[PDB]
Design a binder for these strands. Structure first.
Lengths: 95, 100, 108, 83, 108, 96, 87, 99
DNA sequence: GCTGCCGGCGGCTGGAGAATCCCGGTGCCGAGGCCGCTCAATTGGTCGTAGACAGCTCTAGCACCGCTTAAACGCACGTACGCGCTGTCCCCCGCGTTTAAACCGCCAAGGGGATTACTCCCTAGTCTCCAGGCACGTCTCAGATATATACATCCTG
DNA sequence: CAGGATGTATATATCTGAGACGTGCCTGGAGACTAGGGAGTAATCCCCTTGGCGGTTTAAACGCGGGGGACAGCGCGTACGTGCGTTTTAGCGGTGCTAGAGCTGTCTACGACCAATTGAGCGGCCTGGGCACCGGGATTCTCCAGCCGCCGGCAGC
């Protein structure tokens, strides 16, 4: 009992979407679980502080956008915003 | 008689003594402000700078350079020399973890 | 009826609902918007896909089928942009990048 | 004599005074460009974050709190201008 | 009935109410206890008193009557333990501690 | 003549007069003291909240603050602070 | 005879060839003889710093066992976070 | 008669050999004994999990390798080939750990 | 032997250029009284985290010994170390002089900040059913082993 | 200055079998479907403080020129860290063994939340006068270059 959450399935799917013929070991999956868990907090804390900085109360895509701009170094962030915008511009079009 | 000229390496120690008790800045304000305004043009055009932020950045960059120079002097003294060279600066920035 | 997952509508493979629950229960803010979990999931997907593709290529270069922490280390340490992000972290069972100073090498 | 790039505005005696405050005795003839490059790099690495902070708030001025906040992000805090 | 401040009952010179309100509005957690504000106020009072005394000694040393940032820097950098506490903070108008390497000195 | 602000000036000055009854303080030093107090408070509160969530609790109590203090102040400050905090909180609960 | 088997002089258990192998992995050519104590000292102090936080975490947790979570936790506190142990 | 390699030849081979492997270099039992000896002074009668033991071992491994890298850099700076304790306490002080 | 003879040697003298002290006049600006308002202290009830007790039980330290492999000791020796001589040319350090920052004042106006009416987006509440974690269950093809050849040294002539 | 012999590396043959990949089950939390009311949003106006301008002036930067001593190079003594053989000693392992500490479930009760009143703590705004600023001038304080008495070799006999 006492089910524990994890990101195993989605990491496996993402691996399959780029390399459909490559497997993964046990530790090599917990490593990516820990990396995702680290990045989640590293972005969310910055976004939360940035929202509090202007005496606001709600988290919107704009502060997350600024957090992405600050954290990811340079060219990588240059890509990310685009997909981020992509990832929302469909969703608002068809809820 | 001959004019009184000091032995080499003494006035330098005099300035070392004098400056280490001073607290004021050692870089002219207008050139630094012009440099900051020029270098901020690339990120966004037609920006305004508040007075306090310029001096804040100035003294921050003063302290950073002072620390870097102190570390470089320590490294140079380690190599049984009395002169500092660019390679000492590069090695210091290697070890502290800033360049790489 | 006919319930649909938010990830399917957003065209993503990540649990948008899970991220939304984490944001609420993380005490990050008093109130939470709508597109924030979608944006965060997309960013996470992009980063993990890049890392995993690089690791897969590194493993293939070694003539192996699976992925082991050695391949992860060899892929992470060879990208300066990724090196800046993961400068202050270390992975278990990763080894070190083979490098030898030129002075210590023989004369010829 | 008016055409002078602002990077040249950091005069050599200023570098000498900074070095003397550091605690050095002798200085070679090539430090004056390495210091200029390091200064410029460190300046951009803070002004980028500061200017981004200005953009997010829709303002047009780089206030003191912004610059100290961005310095705190880099790991160099500042006392005196508030906080 | 007549009212009185919490600090008066706890014998403190720091405001319990303001710190408690900050604990409420600082997003830190959902609910806060009762002894936490008193404890935190006591710690802050202790630290402030120690810093003020250490600065005042140095201020009286140079035959002055009011404290200056230079005196604060001198008091902070001359106590190794407090120096470790404030290892990366830079104080405006603080200068630098006087120190000269032995080698740079003359032969005698 | 509006938008009143808040600071720690009065309490710092009051503490100063109880240590050196003949000494004053300039404005820049007072602002430095204010900033230092704010920084320390933010650090301790953040650590305490982090620890409170780390054990999946929902309330911040004196124990959390005490452990956070023990995790930050090196050595002598830690024990002096915990002793004074304990005596102060006992004084508070004893005299309601 | 139940517990409290206090040992002494186990820092000497870090043998010389182990340090030679570590240095060879680092990529050095020649090794002096005076480093064998400085390394043993820096490693010892590092262990004290980590174990202090590791222990006080459990002490706050009012338990009697030190897990891996606490070790990784204290390593993250001092900016030495480590991947691969379920963070 | 019997074949003796030029001095420093085996060092180069060990350098390129150990730089490829990934296993631990310190035996587990002495490290566990040292950890147990150290842990007593903080709170006696404790109980240890293995995962903590190899976590500590890996962390110490990484720290030592990182320190040795800078030690080699400082040694090669001084126009030398060996390493001396002075390079070690130079590297530990430039970093600011012992400052 | 012993006369100069000669160059250094340190020991001392005193001129010289810098740093320090105090006095005397002058401000600019911390320190305190004043008014009121806005938030913190007083009461009052609730209901649900958190503390206890009361259990179950997975697992970490003890021990026991057989194997064996790497750790400890010694041992020639050459090579990289440390010191000493040395030949400069490149930084130190005053001087004339050439110049731009610093002070001081008067303006315009675009943007920062306080006020206000409102609207529609996210939270508050229920019902529901299907994606994901647990327990297996395997046969994989992933590794693990053993084997066999090219290769780069250090000697020789 | 070109070959031979060597202990290393490289490749390639069999096993071989713990555990990535399905495969089901079932459950609890994520999606579908209801207001509301307060958080942000334009819209407005009203200062203010910042970019901009234009005379002095005066202290700092600049190019020149002279000079001496730190530095990179070269050479030699030398001693200690490396390649290798010979024990032997503690690690690895494999097998049980045991109670201790870790995990989860029930029940209760008390203390933090929230809402409604009331008063005083402090934030603003003058306001007088007092400690730091500044000047010159006397007062010491080290830094240096030469003079001098002494001393130890150095040509002769």
């Amino acid at each position: 009992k006492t089910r524990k959450e994890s990101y195993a399935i989605y990491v496996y799917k993402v691996l399959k979407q780029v390399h459909p013929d490559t497997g993964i070991s046990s530790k090599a999956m917990s490593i990516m679980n820990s990396f995702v868990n680290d990045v989640f907090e590293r972005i969310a804390g910055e976004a939360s502080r940035l929202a509090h900085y202007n005496k606001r109360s709600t988290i919107t895509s704009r502060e997350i956008q600024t957090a992405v701009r600050l954290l990811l170094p340079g060219e990588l962030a240059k890509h990310a915003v685009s997909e981020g915008t992509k990832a929302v511009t469909k969703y608002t079009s068809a809820k | 008689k001959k004019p009184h000229r000091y032995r080499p390496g003494t006035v330098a120690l005099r300035e070392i003594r004098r400056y280490q008790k001073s607290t004021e800045l050692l870089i002219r304000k207008l050139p630094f402000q012009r440099l900051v305004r020029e270098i901020a043009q690339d990120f966004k055009t037609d920006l305004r700078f508040q007075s306090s932020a310029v001096m804040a950045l100035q003294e921050a960059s003063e302290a950073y350079l002072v620390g870097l120079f102190e570390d470089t002097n320590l490294c140079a003294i380690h190599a049984k020399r009395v002169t500092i060279m660019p390679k000492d600066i590069q090695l210091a920035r290697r070890i502290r973890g800033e360049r790489a | 009826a006919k319930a649909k997952t938010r990830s399917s509508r957003a065209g993503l493979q990540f649990p948008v609902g899970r991220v939304h629950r984490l944001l609420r229960k993380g005490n990050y803010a008093e109130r939470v918007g709508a597109g924030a979990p979608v944006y965060l999931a997309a960013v996470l997907e992009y980063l993990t896909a890049e890392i995993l593709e690089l690791a897969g290529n590194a493993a293939r270069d070694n003539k192996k089928t699976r992925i082991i922490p050695r391949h992860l280390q060899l892929a992470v340490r060879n990208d300066e942009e990724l090196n800046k992000l993961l400068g202050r972290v270390t992975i278990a069972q990763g080894g070190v990048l083979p490098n030898i100073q030129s002075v210590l090498l023989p004369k010829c | 004599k008016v055409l002078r790039d602002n990077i040249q505005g950091i005069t050599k005696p200023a570098i000498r005074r900074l070095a003397r405050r550091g605690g050095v005795k002798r200085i070679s003839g090539l430090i004056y460009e390495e210091t200029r490059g390091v200064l410029k790099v460190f300046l951009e690495n803070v002004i980028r974050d500061a200017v981004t902070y200005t953009e997010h708030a829709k303002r047009k001025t780089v206030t003191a709190m912004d610059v100290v906040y961005a310095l705190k992000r880099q790991g160099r805090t500042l006392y005196g201008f508030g906080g």
